[PDB]
Design a protein around this nucleic acid. Structure first.
Ligand SMILES: [Mg+2]
Ligand SMILES: [Zn+2]
Lengths: 66, 288, 54, 251, 1316
DNA sequence: TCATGATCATAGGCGGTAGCGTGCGCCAGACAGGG
DNA sequence: CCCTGTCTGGCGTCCTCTCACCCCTATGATCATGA
């Protein structure tokens, strides 16, 4: 289901900006989980370009230079 | 209320009729309040489960898509083929029933001219490429999505479709609500699906299956009526036959589950010991 | 603080209106029977200092 | 925070940290001067319960309060839920160069333009006017330009008509439901104090004119003007993204 | 006959039903409840005496001392209401209490105290209520709102369906005390019976039945019948009553008297029961399998062994029968445990019980209350006697005892406030009866189960909580001190009492700030039945059913006036005729319809007495005697409407206005509006604003005079008489002699309230509406208030409206208004803003208010005087200086940027000790001079009335016609006159005169003391300067106007005069609405209001034509009489033949701007009457005039509807919502802009807008929308330099609030970082 | 000159010799009761 | 150990506007007045 499918992600910032933050941060704390900003909402959090519109061309350039 | 409001707003309404109108009106207002309260949270959960899905390639390179047929509740056809297979890339290339003659190639966006050419030849089921059966790792390719809705051409490489999808589903959530036989209408050939039938003594065709689905194939190929047929129902017709309109072709009992047979012979009791397995209950006021 | 009294017949809420009451030494739900180590085997002390704390 | 009354109604965090430091200093002093055998235990229980009040108040049994019934705020109450850093400060922010007023009709508009007051257009577009003043040479420094546009002299309205001209703004209705709820127009200066908004466009906002209020935002940078012209303009979004029905249906 | 202000402008009245009970005083809930609260009340209850006699005498901890109670008394307040609102104090009265201390001796508490002491003591300050029904808490006029909550008593609810997911319903029986511990009996799906106390842990219910000292034999004696088995020579025979066998299938062949009655395999029919009870069959024969599962009742013991044969409540087996049979017992008592009739719920409950006697039950109850501690028998007895059985901790009220006896079918409605054994046993009996299938459950929303608290009862409860805290202090101090040396004011202290009552009146969830911008808004905020608050439900949790109108709101709570939004149906408003019962329920009037005739006696019915009887509907036709003219009449029996016969009715409604409230009974043609639009119309009629010159409603309901007079905005005459001096400030009435006291000679002075600030920044004015020399009657208006006119209620103004689409400028709901409206200054409302400036006390020294100010020149300081404060009258702009203030740094008060105004009033308050500057001494001399002149004029005016009394007495009995005015006037007593009533009366007037002399001396000294003294103020403030700006806001495109039916709208274009559609007479229409709002939003009442308003103005135009031509009074009398008859059988029936040729000219002077027409709510003017009144004027019959165009000058096809609609300006203006921000201040903890308008803030770019920009491809717009424009401080300073240099470019950086997220997550044990 | 009384200023977390709480509701997943 | 009930954790629209409220009580010390 969509609330369990959104809480079960490989990215703890999305699952923290959604429902319960305590359980998500403790599970990602003891697991040592490592987000890589992976899409839209983590980049809205951290203050950079969305990888959707014009920022999609910017992210293809940034990933090609990796 | 069994005594209705026999007065309109051009004339007056006396006190009780206006009070009953107030029952209805305040029920509606409280529905709208708590309705908005649920609708906003539905939009939130949908844009937070989608959230990430970006059109990130241009061709996945698979074939398996879903099968689009017009929906048939059992009356008029509610949603036709033109309004479902409008602008979505075909899975297997559609061959007209002049078999080994291709009508559309297998990567053609079906815009309005192609949909009219589908409606003319009365195409059965245009198997079409869906987002759920894609192959792109970490995203969704462009051809399996379809037309860019709100525009005309194919979807651009990049437009975040999870967010527009979740808003398009949750946005009419404000408008939503919160709190015997088979009668035919049209005329055509008769189709049966998933049936185990046998011949009775009367000459009809009786059924030994719950999973029977009756269909009305029309003159050009598609289906305009579908009926779930119960277990042990009795048909006045058979498969592949021809009927007329207004003709009830099936009848059963919704109260009784019939245990009808296949072979013709005597009836005996096996592992039926009286007093324990079967009891003696005489029907008092009837006799049988 | 060490106080001698008897629990059941004299119920506490009656005596509550006074000081001497934060609550029993517990280490658990029940009011724990405390030892009197100073009274029994440690009478006279404070040779730590009279530091007059800070 | 001061409340301008000689006293500081403190935040809940300083109260919590003050309780932990009181209890910890008393426990250091009680471990200093020796604990009475089975005694150095109640104080550690109190310290554990004060830290459990600080890290997540209310998760352990009955929460604490300062005044009077409401439980006060720990750290986990600053990260979680609404009124916390994820949903109130990081995903949706308060934004400079913005304003809001009450909408109205004005049917003499083309559908890519909206009426917007002279006072709102003068207060949103201030640094543009400062730049045009010290680029045309009508004020030496920034302070003379600020006092000119505070006095509203007779030349700054020409400056304002020369900065509005090809510069979109974003209009926004307050319950944004779908993506047509934010659109971009080219302003027209209006004597008055309301936002004149094209009528056909109000099919997409679900907006009547019985007291609705809309908010305008300004795209500062150059790429944002191009995105509010090529992607978000009111002439481009004539089809809904839910179907193929037009959204410019005459009402 | 008519009162003299009803001969000014007599309102035309349609309406058919002759009234029998007039509208009561609309503020009787507030005033009657608080009069019930504070009054010297003997016989104990109710009031403050209930608290002072239930918490006192405080007796000590066995120290033989006792602080008992005598009486109480409230002194006068030190400040009257006007000084209290000006200065800012509470409007309180000191509560003196006479307490007594007695101290008993040793060995005899039944012996003599050695010493008593009775004395006066000070405790608390309770705030009084003003005559308007409001409180003044800190200078702001507040209202405490009535609460609707659950009635104390038993309540048998049924948890239907949802539990256990198998359809098996539960049944719980909540006993709701008024004060104490709750008690919930319930079931479970195993059909056991479970008690619980205050929602705590669950126990089996019979554990409390042992706690009331019942043995188990007595419990089964109570809760079951008995079945008798007699061992008489054959198979252990049975006593059988066949009523238990109604439908049971026997296991054998029941025969008796040598006759087969019942066969095996069949059931016992009812006729077989008749056979067995007709033959009187007693003993039948049972097999050995019949008592295989019968449950024994009581204990049987064997006499030989002394052991127990079988325990109580145990099924019987073969060996138990073999044991008790050979022990000598012939009688066996068992129980009847049927499937349908009587389940063994008590028996299964006793089988789950581990307890066995009283002590173990009390131990288990003491253990479920306080967990994990050693119980003792004394502690368990004390706890269980202090849960339910003590006068202290448990108290049903009289309401509670009434519901508890009524819902258990008792007789006496009087009992003790505590429970007993019979009470709990009757609760369990009724719960088992409801489970058995007979009897019904009780719904919640039924208004026989919803009590109404008010101001008096809630203030009593908060005062009682203050008293139990202070008895928790007095019990501490009384037995821990030396006696006798102290007095009972050293013990009891006034801090918790005053803190409790001041916290309740100060900040509660029901003591709320009065919405005061309208007389209607006052009088409908005071009448509010809120469901929220303490003891009720909450908005964001519940629910569905409580937000719905129950069938018994008819005539108690209004169905259509409620706020839409998050709390619909919780903020209910009480109806018009709805009183409050003795206990607290709602009651409404009816007319006792005896067998044929509707008797005109009123008769108040409650909510449960209404259900049993049958009530006729309000508008049923009856022919002059009371005989119902139909033979089927629409009535309602038990919450359900139907059609009944002519003379089975028992009550009729009083008047047809009683379902609605006073908010929604000023709507004309209410029966034509759909209920949603009537709701929105009533709510916006509450939200109006007072205009400059309020006019009148042409189409009213006649309910305007009740709302105007029965509120407190007009100056109602107390004693009638003759006016002597009218002024814009004061009004002097000379009291008539047939209404007048013998002493205290008496001519009344009404000091009107001129321009002052309301709570919603409107302008609460009072204008005198009487002439000079004019007679006034008792109970009559003298001075109109805000939004009143001649004693009526004029909220908005009535304007010429046309329904036509006009070139798109009224597209959705918009309104288009001619410039003729704004030229006439007719919506030009007047607002008043209060701007405060305090002189605080900081370091480097105090502040300066003087005008020697740095950084300023002549152009600022020209509008200040020589001491900083702006003048009275200086018309300022937005951003000048009002008060100049410099700190040890300019911090002068300024007009906030945007508002103009004219400074009308300046107050200066000085903390005592501080040097008064020259303007504070100017205000002190000014107010000294004003109060000096005012009290001297009090003495002069009352002395003039006294000398007029002396002249009136000396007309007879030793009259001196010439000698009276030769001597000075102060000696009119020693003239020639014997010892009569006249020299006695002159001596009494000399007593009054010398009293006025010495009273004037002492009161002028006290008033100089009040002006000269300082005022107690904030900690560390020198002086407070308050300045009142008086803005005059006219009208503009963007304001919100609305009619009285829900037709809202933002006014969209203020056209010129010429563009308006005019007709073939010449007059332009004022407002052009939109027709398309009528068929969807079904408010068809506004079109009937429009047509009847055009009829009213047609009659007004014909009066103006017959009067402008200077015609004699005969033709005016003719036409006014024809316009006042005009209808069916109506109520008005006026005649102008008793107005005498001078009032008719003045009545026509008041009718020439239109003729007011009353239209009551559900008995209004029909269509044919509107047509006949439009035929009296020469207007067209259909109401539609053909209208030309203003632009083209050519005719609109298909003639359009014009008329007059009464439209209201709402105070959602557009220069209070409009806001704009380039770059302002920034918040401190997260570097984002501030929120709001007063704080110069920016609009919240919320979360759904972020989603809507992700939904496009706009990426740079969102990046600057949440990094550059909002948060990043170096990013936004780079942005500001780049914008003022022409380079549109952003240097992004990081949001600083994300660094705040890192510090808050990092301040835990969590280690968040940023890699690479 | 000394003592007593009154007034003013400064200083902390149910208030009491108990009991207050009581009108949301669903889902879900772990913890444990019964068999 | 295999259900099956209980328990306690989560969650419950957006934007804006207005208003009030944000310790008082007790103890100790100092000063003044009276004996
Ligand atoms: Mg609207
Ligand atoms: Zn694909």
């Amino acid at each position: 289901g969509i609330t369990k499918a959104s809480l079960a992600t490989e990215s703890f910032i999305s699952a923290a900006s959604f429902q319960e933050t305590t359980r998500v941060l403790t599970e990602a704390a003891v697991a040592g989980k490592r987000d890589e900003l992976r899409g839209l909402k983590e980049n809205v959090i951290v203050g950079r370009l969305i990888p959707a519109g014009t920022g999609y061309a910017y992210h293809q350039d940034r990933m090609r230079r990796r | 209320i069994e005594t209705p409001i026999t007065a309109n707003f051009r004339e007056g309404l006396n006190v009780l009729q206006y009070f009953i109108s107030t029952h209805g009106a305040r029920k509606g207002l409280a529905d709208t309040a708590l309705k908005t309260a649920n609708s906003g949270y539905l939009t939130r959960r949908l844009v937070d489960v989608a959230q990430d899905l970006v059109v990130t390639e241009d061709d996945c390179g698979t074939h398996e898509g879903i099968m689009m047929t017009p929906v048939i509740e059992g009356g008029d056809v509610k949603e036709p083929l033109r309004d479902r297979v409008l602008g979505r890339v075909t899975a297997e290339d559609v061959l007209k029933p002049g078999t080994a003659d291709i009508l559309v190639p297998r990567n053609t966006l079906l815009h309005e001219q192609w949909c009219d050419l589908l409606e003319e030849n009365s195409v059965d089921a245009v198997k079409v490429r869906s987002v759920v059966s894609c192959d792109t790792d970490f995203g969704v390719c462009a051809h399996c999505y379809g037309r860019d809705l709100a525009r005309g051409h194919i979807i651009n490489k990049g437009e975040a479709i999870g967010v527009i999808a979740a808003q398009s589903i949750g946005e009419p959530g404000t408008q939503l609500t919160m709190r015997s036989s088979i009668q035919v209408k049209n005329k055509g050939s008769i189709k049966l699906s998933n049936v185990k039938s046998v011949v009775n003594s009367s000459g009809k065709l009786v059924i030994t299956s719950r999973n029977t689905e009756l269909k009305l194939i029309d003159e050009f190929g598609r289906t305009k009526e579908s009926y779930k047929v119960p277990y042990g129902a009795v048909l006045a017709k058979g498969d592949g036959e021809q009927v007329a309109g207004g003709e009830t072709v099936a009848n059963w009992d919704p109260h009784t589950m019939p245990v009808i047979t296949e072979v013709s012979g005597f009836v005996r009791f096996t592992d039926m010991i009286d007093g324990q397995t079967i009891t003696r209950q005489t029907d008092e006021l009837t006799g049988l | 603080l060490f106080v001698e009294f008897d629990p059941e017949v004299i119920h506490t809420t009656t005596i509550n209106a006074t000081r001497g009451v934060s609550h029993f030494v517990r280490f658990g739900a029940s009011p724990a029977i405390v030892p009197s180590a100073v009274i029994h085997q440690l009478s006279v002390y404070k040779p730590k200092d009279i530091v007059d704390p800070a | 925070v001061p409340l301008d009354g000689g006293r500081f109604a403190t935040s809940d965090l300083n109260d919590l940290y003050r309780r932990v430091i009181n209890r910890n200093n008393r426990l250091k002093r009680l471990l200093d001067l020796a604990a009475p055998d089975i005694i150095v235990r109640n104080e550690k229980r109190m310290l554990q319960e004060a830290v459990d009040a600080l890290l997540d108040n209310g998760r352990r049994g009955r929460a604490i309060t300062g005044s009077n019934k409401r439980p006060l705020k720990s750290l986990a109450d600053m990260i979680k839920g609404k009124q916390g850093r994820f949903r109130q400060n990081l995903l949706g922010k308060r934004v400079d160069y913005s304003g809001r007023s009450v909408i109205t009709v004005g049917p003499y508009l083309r559908l890519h333009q909206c009426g917007l007051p002279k006072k709102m257009a003068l207060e949103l577009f201030k640094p543009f006017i400062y730049g045009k003043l010290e680029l045309r040479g009508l004020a030496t420094t920034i302070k003379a330009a600020k006092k000119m546009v505070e006095r509203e002299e007779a030349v700054v309205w020409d400056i304002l008509d020369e900065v509005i001209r090809e510069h979109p703004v974003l209009l926004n209705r307050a319950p944004t439901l779908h993506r047509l709820g934010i659109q971009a127009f080219e302003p027209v200066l209006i004597e008055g104090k309301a936002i004149q908004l094209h009528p056909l466009v109000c099919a997409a906002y679900n907006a009547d004119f019985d007291g609705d209020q809309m908010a305008v935002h300004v795209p500062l940078t150059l790429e944002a003007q191009l995105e509010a012209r090529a992607l978000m303009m009111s002439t481009n979004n004539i089809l809904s993204p839910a179907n193929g029905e037009p959204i410019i249906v005459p009402s | 006959v008519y009162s003299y202000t009803e001969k000014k402008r007599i309102r035309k009245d349609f309406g058919k039903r002759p009234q029998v009970l007039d509208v009561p005083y609309l503020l009787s809930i507030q005033l009657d409840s608080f009069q019930k609260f504070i009054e010297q009340d003997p016989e104990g209850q109710y009031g403050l005496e209930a608290a002072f006699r239930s918490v006192f005498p405080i007796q000590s901890y066995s120290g033989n001392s006792e602080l008992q109670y005598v009486s109480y008394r409230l002194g006068e307040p030190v400040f009257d209401v006007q000084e209290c609102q000006i200065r800012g104090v509470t409007y309180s009265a000191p509560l003196r209490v006479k307490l007594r201390l007695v101290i008993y001796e040793r060995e005899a508490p039944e012996g003599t105290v050695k010493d008593i002491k009775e004395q006066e003591v000070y405790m608390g300050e309770i705030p009084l209520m003003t005559d308007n029904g409001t409180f003044v808490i800190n200078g702001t006029e507040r209202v405490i709102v009535s609460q609707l909550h659950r009635s104390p008593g038993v309540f048998f609810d049924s948890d239907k369906g949802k539990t256990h997911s198998s359809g098996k319903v539960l049944y719980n029986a909540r006993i709701i005390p008024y004060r104490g511990s709750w008690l919930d009996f319930e079931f479970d799906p195993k059909d056991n019976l479970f008690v619980r106390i205050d929602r705590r842990r669950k126990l089996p219910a019979t554990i409390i039945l042992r706690a009331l000292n019942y043995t188990t034999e007595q419990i089964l004696d109570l809760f079951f019948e008995k079945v008798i088995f007699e061992i008489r020579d054959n198979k252990l025979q049975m006593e059988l009553v066949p009523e238990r066998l109604r439908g049971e299938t026997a296991s054998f062949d029941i025969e008796a008297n040598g006759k087969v009655y019942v066969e095996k395999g069949r059931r016992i029919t009812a006729r077989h029961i008749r056979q067995l009870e007709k033959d009187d069959v007693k003993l039948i024969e049972v097999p050995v399998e019949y008592i295989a599962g019968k449950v024994v009742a009581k204990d049987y013991i064997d006499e030989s062994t002394g052991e127990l044969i079988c325990a109580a409540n145990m099924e019987l087996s073969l060996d138990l029968l073999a044991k008790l049979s050979q022990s000598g017992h012939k009688r066996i008592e068992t129980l009847f445990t049927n499937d349908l009739d009587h389940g063994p719920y008590i028996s299964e409950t006793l089988r789950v019980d581990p307890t066995n006697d009283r002590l173990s039950a009390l131990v288990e109850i003491y253990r479920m209350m306080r967990p994990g501690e050693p119980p003792t028998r004394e502690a368990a007895e004390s706890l269980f006697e202090n849960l339910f059985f003590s006068e202290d901790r448990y108290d049903l009220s009289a309401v509670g005892r009434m519901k508890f006896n009524r819902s258990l079918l008792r007789e006496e409605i009087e009992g003790s406030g505590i429970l007993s054994k019979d009470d709990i046993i009757d609760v369990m009996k009724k719960l088992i009866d409801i489970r058995n299938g007979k009897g019904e459950v009780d719904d919640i929303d039924h208004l026989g189960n919803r009590r109404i608290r008010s101001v008096g009862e809630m203030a009593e409860n908060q005062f009682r909580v203050g008293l139990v805290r202070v008895e928790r202090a007095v019990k501490e101090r009384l037995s821990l001190g030396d006696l006798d040396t102290l007095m009972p004011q050293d013990m009891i202290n006034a801090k918790p009492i005053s803190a409790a009552v001041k916290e309740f009146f100060g900040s509660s969830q029901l003591s709320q700030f009065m919405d005061q911008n309208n007389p209607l808004s006052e009088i409908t905020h005071k009448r509010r039945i809120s469901a929220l608050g303490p003891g009720g439900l909450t908005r964001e949790r519940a629910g569905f059913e409580v937000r719905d109108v129950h069938p018994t709101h008819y005539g108690r709570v209004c169905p259509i006036e409620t706020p839409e939004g998050p709390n619909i149906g919780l903020i209910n408003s009480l109806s018009v005729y709805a009183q409050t019962n003795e206990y607290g329920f709602l009651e409404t009037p009816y007319r006792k319809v005896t067998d044929g005739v509707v008797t005109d006696e009123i008769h108040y019915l409650s909510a449960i007495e209404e259900g049993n009887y049958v009530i006729a509907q309000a508008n049923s036709n009856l022919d002059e005697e009371g005989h119902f003219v139909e033979d089927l009449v629409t009535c309602r029996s038990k919450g359900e409407s139907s059609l009944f016969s002519r003379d089975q009715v028992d009550y009729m409604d009083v008047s047809t206005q009683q379902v609605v409230s006073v908010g929604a009974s000023l709507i004309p043609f209410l029966e034509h509006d759909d209920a949603n639009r009537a709701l929105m119309g009533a709510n916006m009629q509450r939200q109006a604003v007072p205009t400059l010159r309020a006019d009148k409603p042409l189409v009213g309901t006649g309910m305007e005079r009740a709302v105007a007079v029965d509120s407190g905005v007009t100056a109602v005459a107390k004693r009638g008489g003759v006016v002597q001096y009218v002024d814009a400030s004061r009004i002097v009435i000379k009291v008539n002699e047939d209404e007048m006291y013998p002493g205290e000679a008496g001519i009344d002075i009404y000091n009107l309230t001129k321009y002052t600030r309301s709570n919603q920044n409107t302008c609460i004015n009072q204008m005198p509406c009487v002439s000079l020399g004019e007679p006034v009657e008792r109970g009559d208006v003298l001075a109109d208030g805000p939004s009143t006119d001649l004693g009526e209620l004029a909220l908005g103004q009535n304007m010429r409206v046309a329904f036509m689409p006009w070139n798109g400028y009224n597209f959705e709901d918009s309104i288009l208004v001619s410039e003729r409206v704004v030229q006439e200054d007719r919506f030009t409302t007047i607002h008043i803003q209060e701007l405060a400036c305090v002189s605080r006390d900081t370091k480097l020294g105090p502040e300066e208010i003087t005008a020697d100010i740095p950084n300023v020149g002549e152009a600022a300081l020209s509008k200040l005087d020589e001491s900083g404060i702006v003048y009275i009258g200086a018309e300022v702009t937005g951003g000048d200086i009002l008060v100049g203030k410099v700190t040890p740094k300019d911090s002068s008060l300024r007009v906030p940027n945007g508002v103009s105004g004219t400074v009308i009033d300046v107050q200066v308050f000085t903390r005592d000790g501080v040097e008064k500057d020259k303007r504070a001494l100017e205000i002190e001399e000014m107010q000294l001079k004003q109060a000096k002149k005012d009290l001297s004029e009090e003495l002069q005016i009352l002395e003039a009335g006294l000398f007029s009394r002396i002249r009136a007495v000396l007309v007879a009995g030793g009259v001196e016609a010439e000698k009276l005015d030769k001597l000075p006037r102060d000696r009119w007593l020693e003239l020639g006159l014997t010892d009569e009533e006249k020299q006695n009366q002159l001596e009494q007037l000399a007593e009054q005169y010398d009293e006025l002399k010495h009273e004037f001396e002492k009161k002028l000294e006290a008033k100089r003391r009040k002006i000269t003294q300082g005022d107690d103020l904030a900690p560390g403030v020198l002086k407070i300067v308050k300045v009142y700006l008086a803005v005059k806001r006219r009208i503009q495109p963007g304001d919100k106007m609305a009619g009285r039916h829900g037709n809202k709208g933002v006014i969209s274009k203020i056209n010129p005069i010429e563009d308006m559609p005019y007709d073939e007479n010449g007059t332009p229409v004022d407002i052009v609405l939109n027709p398309l709002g009528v068929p969807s939003r079904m408010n068809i009442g506004q079109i009937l209001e429009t047509h009847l308003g055009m009829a009213a103005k047609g009659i007004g135009d014909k009066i103006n034509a017959m009067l402008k031509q200077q015609q004699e009074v005969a033709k005016l009398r003719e036409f006014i009489q024809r316009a006042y008859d005009l209808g069916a059988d109506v109520r008005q029936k006026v005649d102008l033949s008793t107005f005498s040729d001078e009032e008719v000219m003045r009545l026509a002077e008041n009718l020439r701007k239109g003729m007011p027409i009353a239209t009551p709510v559900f008995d209004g003017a029909k269509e044919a009457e509107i047509k006949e009144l439009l035929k009296l004027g020469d207007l067209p019959t259909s109401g539609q005039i053909r209208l030309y165009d203003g632009r083209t000058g050519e005719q609109f096809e298909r003639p359009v509807t014009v008329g007059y609609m009464y439209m209201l300006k709402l105070n959602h203006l557009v220069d209070d919502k409009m806001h704009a921000r380039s770059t302002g201040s920034y918040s401190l903890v997260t570097q984002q802009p501030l929120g709001g308008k007063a704080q110069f803030g920016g609009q919240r770019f919320g979360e759904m807008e972020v989603w809507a920009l992700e939904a496009y491809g706009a990426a740079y717009t969102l990046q600057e929308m949440l990094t550059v424009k909002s948060d990043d401080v170096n990013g936004r300073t780079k942005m500001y330099k780049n914008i003022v240099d022409g380079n549109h470019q952003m240097e992004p950086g990081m949001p600083e609030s994300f660094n705040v997220l890192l510090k808050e997550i990092r301040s835990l044990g969590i280690n968040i970082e940023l890699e690479d």
